[PDB]
Amino acid sequence: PVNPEKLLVITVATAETEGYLRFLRSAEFFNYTVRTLGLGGQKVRWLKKEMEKYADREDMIIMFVDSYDVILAGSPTELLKKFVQSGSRLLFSAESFCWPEWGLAEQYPEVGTGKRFLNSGGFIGFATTIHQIVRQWKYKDDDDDQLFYTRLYLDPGLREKLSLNLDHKSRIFQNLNGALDEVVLKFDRNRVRIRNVAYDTLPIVVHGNGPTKLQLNYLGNYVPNGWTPEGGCGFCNQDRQPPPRVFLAVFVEQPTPFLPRFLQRLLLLDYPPDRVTLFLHNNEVFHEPHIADSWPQLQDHFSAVKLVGPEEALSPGEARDMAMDLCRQDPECEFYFSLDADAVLTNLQTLRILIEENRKVIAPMLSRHGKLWSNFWGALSPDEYYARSEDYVELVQRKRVGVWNVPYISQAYVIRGDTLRMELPQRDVFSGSDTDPDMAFCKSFRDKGIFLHLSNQHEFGRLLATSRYDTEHLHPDLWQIFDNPVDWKEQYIHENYSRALEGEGIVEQPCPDVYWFPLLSEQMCDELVAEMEHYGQWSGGRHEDSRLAGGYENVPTVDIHMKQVGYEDQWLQLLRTYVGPMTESLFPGYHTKARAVMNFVVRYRPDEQPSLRPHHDSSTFTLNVALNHKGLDYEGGGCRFLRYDCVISSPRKGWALLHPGRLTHYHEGLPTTWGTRYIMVSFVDP
Amino acid sequence: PVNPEKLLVITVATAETEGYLRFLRSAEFFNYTVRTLGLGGQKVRWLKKEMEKYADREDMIIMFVDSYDVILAGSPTELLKKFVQSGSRLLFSAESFCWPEWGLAEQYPEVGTGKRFLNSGGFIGFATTIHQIVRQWKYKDDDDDQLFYTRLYLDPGLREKLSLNLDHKSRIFQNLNGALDEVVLKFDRNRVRIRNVAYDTLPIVVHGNGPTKLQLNYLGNYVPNGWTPEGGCGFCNQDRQPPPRVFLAVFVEQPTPFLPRFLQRLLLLDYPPDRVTLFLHNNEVFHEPHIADSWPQLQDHFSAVKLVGPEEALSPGEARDMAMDLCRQDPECEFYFSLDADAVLTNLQTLRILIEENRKVIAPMLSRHGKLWSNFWGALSPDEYYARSEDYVELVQRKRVGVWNVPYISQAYVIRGDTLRMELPQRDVFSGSDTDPDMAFCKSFRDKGIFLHLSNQHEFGRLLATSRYDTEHLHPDLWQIFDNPVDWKEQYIHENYSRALEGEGIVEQPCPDVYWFPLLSEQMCDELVAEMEHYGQWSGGRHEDSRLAGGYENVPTVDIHMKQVGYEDQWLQLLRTYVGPMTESLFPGYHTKARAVMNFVVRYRPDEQPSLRPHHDSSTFTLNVALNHKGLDYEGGGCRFLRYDCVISSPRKGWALLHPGRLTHYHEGLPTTWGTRYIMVSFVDP
Ligand SMILES: *[C@@H]1O[C@H](CO)[C@@H](O[C@@H]2O[C@H](CO)[C@@H](O)[C@H](O)[C@H]2NC(C)=O)[C@H](O)[C@H]1NC(C)=O
Ligand SMILES: *[C@@H]1O[C@H](CO)[C@@H](O[C@@H]2O[C@H](CO)[C@@H](O)[C@H](O)[C@H]2NC(C)=O)[C@H](O)[C@H]1NC(C)=O
Ligand SMILES: *[C@@H]1O[C@H](CO)[C@@H](O)[C@H](O)[C@H]1NC(C)=O
Ligand SMILES: *[C@@H]1O[C@H](CO)[C@@H](O)[C@H](O)[C@H]1NC(C)=O
Ligand SMILES: O=C(O)CCC(=O)C(=O)O
Ligand SMILES: O=C(O)CCC(=O)C(=O)O
Ligand SMILES: [Fe+2]
Ligand SMILES: [Fe+2]
Ligand SMILES: [Fe+2]
Ligand SMILES: [Fe+2]
Ligand SMILES: [Mn+2]
Ligand SMILES: [Mn+2]
């Protein structure tokens, strides 16, 4: 049994990058002893000088491995046991490819189903045997170390004398390149390993050599104590006097729904505004009225503000370069926060949480509501298109939560200002090529060995759909009930609707079988009324309605139907989602799909039609929503139910009436004496 | 100016018949002096002997006229003025036909547009001139008086010497035969005359000679004081201790609706039953159960009773002969009352009123409800078929009321027993020929000069329709809603329905929008239930209904639809007539034609289906009629309206519930624990 205190791990690194520190944490997890060369071709020269101290130490086992692209998955005890089991005095890692000299592939011994060729990224042997190898180095730093070990190994006499071997079946070393299909994660309670399903082994050293850095990043999120079924993630903050100064950059590169809401939300972020500088690039002339309306509040709120409008003809890549460089060139910019207009931050502590994670680059996970689409990618295709990773759905669904090393992030991220100055000083981060600005940004950080972190440890927010947003309306957000229903409800559905639907005594019954509940917010009423007048073609003479009064005759109103303004599909959707469930609640036993042929807005004026004579409705039940204020906008009565001698004297603006349309509720519209009275009517289930 | 006290009217009559007395009343109306010969050919012999007393009375004007077929229409003053105007000493009446000797027509003077030939039924002249004519009679009673006067008149020398003339243009005498189209009634305030529109004259003497007795009967109902626009009829009773003994004869010669009702009505006639003998001839085996059920009550009610059933194979003519002869052969039968089963006597004083009119034969006017058809004819065709008289519609509509001399009566009449014994002693009154028994009866009385009187002075009753009465039912009267709606309502519609419909606080509201009103009588419920069980094919497994419960699913019942028993058309009629107007009253503003696809009788039993789970109705409103008694026939609850926490604990048998079918009135049928519970359901306006 070889003594673990006699095992020494040697690696080389010239800077404490995130990869090197990831390697050290995995080594410290298993209580390895690590000697790092070169911090304070050239690899062998450093190792050879290092080995002269251990030239006679037959009692020492030394494992040399890379650090930037290596994680440890097993204990020194298991490692020394497998080394003794190999019966070798210097065991090299094996791999699928023979390089740099492909011609030397013939000199290699036949291996069978295992890997045949040497890889100098990881080997383990006795100090004495290794010293006899590395002392034979008398070349220069530019020269190839892989060729040095390969030629020495291919020496048949030197191979048998020193007992050199290759770990053919990946018992100890696992090189990822050429063997991605062989490696799977093997989970335990508080530790994760890899398994080679080709040779049924549990390698100790995971080496992401060649073009497999992204696959190592993925494995490194678990191995050895990245994320565990019982302990969760092991490097995140988990459970959570001046805060750092932050440059907040907002980007509007396309017409975006609910932008006035996004701008107003900027005033609610729980981070001191005197410590935040706002940069806002708006590329859309359609959003110029929006930016202008809320700019006075933003200017008073934040420390400093700056707007770059559509007039400067800035492409998204140029605007993102400019905003990022403004932070880079300011020694007082400690953190850079890039937030796109289609990102809805439901968690107002997002900027704090991400800063406290203390990463170079970190994004809050944001997903399109009810779908898998989100602001990060788990994997890439060879030509850098989206590909779904093995754990992508688990992360989006938050089955596994933590801080994850991912190939792609977007729409919201926080970048350490020191990183922009020291490690990424160039201006062309998003620009400089024909590739997409968002992908050029991720590649720029990947090319410098900078991890892109993603946190789903909390609920941060969601992503608006902007794909096909019809801007040809007076209020386009009114037509967003399908694409962004969650945000459409927060803007247009009355705030106390859900409380009323859940009971809580909000629903009223002003007349016997007539119910009264809050439905539309004051903004929906104002925009719907405005949209009606913008059309302007109200009905008049020869207008016919589905009303029954004193026999087979019809009662008309000055009105506009939803079909005319192209809003029936949208209003029908509201009827299904909100009116329907309310009607089944208030009328136990009744079921409805909220069918409605007659949906229309009535206008009452003393100038034209001020009243509506007694009549019945061609409907099972009728929805009657007030659209403006009694007293402020109009005077005069509302609704009278003659058989019950009951009158809705004061209609509440956002609220709606629900009454039977036939037989029992002969109803009348009282004359409107001053101003203009607007209501929204639906004859449901005809 | 000739003195009216010098004018004497002479007529001949051997009995004081109704025609003779009619003539006398018209004569007494104008204060004529009438000498009747022959009371205590042969006509001339009596007149000739009479005239010998006045052979030298040049101061006397004598008018000889018939009496049985003559009515006077003018005053002696006007008569003497027109006689003086004629410039004649013996003026005969003129007519269109030359008889008995047609060959003598050539000897007559040419007359132009007037009548050319003599009629010996009426002449006026000086007593002296008449004596010189009548004294020339030396023949026998069998010989012809018309030929006697005609040959004397055609003597050219005697015609000029005595100044004989004919009333060519009907200035004084109007013979009806051959001039019916020339005669119209001329009305005044309190007197009616005739006018000859051919010659524009107002004749004094109306003579219904030849085959014109019926037309004289018609004229005689007005002239001179028969019926007047301001005085009304002048020989009727107008404004109304043992009563005379009466033989009441009832005839059932065809299947007749509501016969149990007719039989029970016999017990309510306001005439002492100890003075009435009942004869009942029933020809229908279908009515044998009816006669038997009510015979014990009839036997106890009347003085004596006698039934002649279908087993004696008696034709209607034979039965009517037998019943009439039973009265004729009994000196104690003072009046004979013949009442057919299709005659509904709404006036229980009918027998009194007709007896107090003091006529030989008199009928109460009875008409089919809402139609002109009635129990008398105003006119006849030459072959004795129905013809409409000039005043028929006025009499049926009771625009003119009185007691009218008519050619035909039926279905109800009162005959003086003395008339049957003295004036109509034969047995074959209705029988003895191939003519109809009802027409043979009228002809028999007409042939004896007996008037057939008809009284519309009061509202007496109506005539049931028996034309197509489908006897192939357990209760055929249930299907009489179309043919006899008035009588169908009295039997099957609840007695307090009309009072409830007119207000009076009978209608109740046991639950919020659920109304409760009396609809069906206890007899309708018992017969409808009995008719359902007689069919017996109640529904069971796979039975589907138009009920909505907890989604798109259907709730079944053990029931039978009206369509199955062939009663939908009849029940739909009841819905229109009675349910409809009630629904529009209780739901002001709602209009309905009472459409209903689902009409059915539900049966509840603990053995089978005792309850009905909560559900809605496929209807605007639902009619729910109880059909039996809670407690007596069944135990267990009725109807529960869940949204209102209201229960119809005790359903009233005849009553019905009216509630909305959709949205608001989720209702449930409580389990029936004992017995059998029947209800009638209609889903109106689906
Ligand atoms: C939703 O309900 C809340 C509470 O029931 C409403 O809040 C109140 O607003 C009125 C003024 O309109 C104040 O006088 C009360 O003091 C408030 N109550 C509370 C508890 O804050 C709120 O107005 C309702 N929403 C809308 C749109 O009216
Ligand atoms: C129709 O209404 C009358 C009066 O409202 C009902 O008559 C009463 O009958 C009950 C017995 O059922 C008696 O106790 C009362 O004294 C009666 N009142 C009068 C004023 O006579 C009659 O019952 C109703 N019709 C039906 C079929 O029930
Ligand atoms: C590593 O060593 C420390 C003491 O130096 C010990 O507490 C810990 O349990 C060790 N961990 C492992 C995995 O052996
Ligand atoms: C008939 O005579 C009586 C008196 O005898 C007289 O009262 C009556 O008015 C007369 N009627 C007519 C119509 O002359
Ligand atoms: O003005 C009202 O409140 C009555 C509305 C109504 O019944 C209708 O819109 O047809
Ligand atoms: O039994 C009752 O009264 C409920 C009747 C009902 O709702 C039905 O007949 O469908
Ligand atoms: Fe309309
Ligand atoms: Fe309406
Ligand atoms: Fe049924
Ligand atoms: Fe029902
Ligand atoms: Mn490497
Ligand atoms: Mn005569």
Side-chain angles (χ1 to χ4, degrees), chain A residues 613-633:
Chain A
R613 51 184 170 103
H615 61 285
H616 283 300
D617 278 329
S618 179
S619 72
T620 313
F621 73 91
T622 299
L623 177 78
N624 199 339
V625 196
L627 292 185
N628 55 8
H629 287 291
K630 174 159 187 155
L632 281 60
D633 305 69

Side-chain angles (χ1 to χ4, degrees), chain A residues 420-435:
Chain A
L420 304 177
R421 289 183 271 278
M422 303 308 302
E423 309 173 78
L424 210 80
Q426 70 264 31
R427 171 117 182 164
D428 297 326
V429 172
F430 305 77
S431 311
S433 48
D434 265 310
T435 189

Side-chain angles (χ1 to χ4, degrees), chain A residues 129 146 148 150 159 161 177 190 209 306 331 396 414 430 466 468 494 528 605:
Chain A
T129 305
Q146 173 79 339
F148 171 58
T150 293
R159 181 164 74 246
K161 171 186 151 219
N177 192 19
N190 301 292
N209 65 317
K306 188 184 199 177
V396 172
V414 168
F430 305 77
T466 88
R468 270 187 146 250
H494 193 279
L528 171 66
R605 282 179 173 173

Side-chain angles (χ1 to χ4, degrees), chain A residues 328-475:
Chain A
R328 181 191 287 102
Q329 304 303 324
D330 192 340
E332 290 283 309
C333 183
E334 199 169 341
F335 287 103
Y336 176 68
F337 186 11
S338 175
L339 185 70
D340 287 354
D342 53 341
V344 177
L345 287 181
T346 66
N347 189 325
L348 302 174
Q349 285 70 225
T350 294
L351 177 55
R352 288 175 180 275
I353 294 161
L354 295 170
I355 288 180
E356 308 204 315
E357 276 297 337
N358 190 36
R359 308 299 226 272
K360 298 185 182 179
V361 183
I362 184 164
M365 190 183 79
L366 309 173
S367 301
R368 172 93 159 90
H369 184 84
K371 310 179 193 294
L372 289 188
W373 306 114
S374 59
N375 69 318
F376 78 107
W377 300 358
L380 296 171
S381 92
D383 40 0
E384 308 190 320
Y385 292 133
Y386 175 88
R388 186 191 285 194
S389 61
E390 195 107 33
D391 56 352
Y392 180 86
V393 181
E394 288 97 310
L395 303 193
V396 172
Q397 300 184 342
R398 304 189 69 245
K399 310 288 184 183
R400 307 176 181 168
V401 303
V403 182
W404 311 86
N405 188 347
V406 300
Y408 180 99
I409 61 183
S410 66
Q411 279 143 325
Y413 38 82
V414 168
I415 302 178
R416 181 186 298 157
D418 274 5
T419 299
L420 304 177
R421 289 183 271 278
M422 303 308 302
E423 309 173 78
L424 210 80
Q426 70 264 31
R427 171 117 182 164
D428 297 326
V429 172
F430 305 77
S431 311
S433 48
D434 265 310
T435 189
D436 177 71
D438 305 295
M439 172 56 71
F441 149 80
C442 295
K443 277 182 61 201
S444 295
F445 276 92
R446 303 205 315 261
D447 288 359
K448 289 298 166 54
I450 312 297
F451 292 175
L452 307 177
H453 288 97
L454 175 93
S455 180
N456 65 334
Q457 191 141 61
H458 307 117
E459 278 285 343
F460 289 105
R462 59 179 176 268
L463 295 179
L464 299 170
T466 88
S467 45
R468 270 187 146 250
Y469 175 44
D470 185 16
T471 199
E472 294 144 16
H473 297 291
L474 181 59
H475 295 276

Side-chain angles (χ1 to χ4, degrees), chain B residues 478-482 488 561-577 594 596-597 599 680:
Chain B
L478 268 179
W479 276 267
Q480 283 292 298
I481 190 178
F482 296 113
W488 196 95
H561 282 255
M562 297 294 98
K563 209 148 193 161
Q564 313 183 235
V565 288
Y567 203 69
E568 172 163 276
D569 276 353
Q570 294 67 25
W571 181 258
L572 286 184
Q573 184 57 61
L574 176 150
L575 284 171
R576 264 185 304 267
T577 304
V597 163
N599 318 273
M680 176 61 193

Side-chain angles (χ1 to χ4, degrees), chain A residues 50-68:
Chain A
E50 179 71 23
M51 284 290 92
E52 297 174 351
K53 317 194 303 295
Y54 307 123
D56 311 319
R57 299 294 304 273
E58 178 83 44
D59 58 317
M60 269 175 61
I61 304 304
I62 280 154
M63 157 169 286
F64 185 91
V65 293
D66 292 337
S67 54
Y68 294 160

Side-chain angles (χ1 to χ4, degrees), chain B residues 43 65-70 119-122 175 207-210 213:
Chain B
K43 288 195 244 181
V65 293
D66 292 337
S67 54
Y68 294 160
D69 56 359
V70 165
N119 183 281
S120 50
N175 292 318
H207 185 190
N209 65 317
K213 314 293 169 166

Side-chain angles (χ1 to χ4, degrees), chain B residues 494-497 499 504 506 518 520-522 655:
Chain B
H494 193 279
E495 67 170 8
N496 292 330
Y497 162 87
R499 294 79 194 255
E504 282 200 68
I506 296 175
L520 301 182
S521 73
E522 273 201 52
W655 291 55

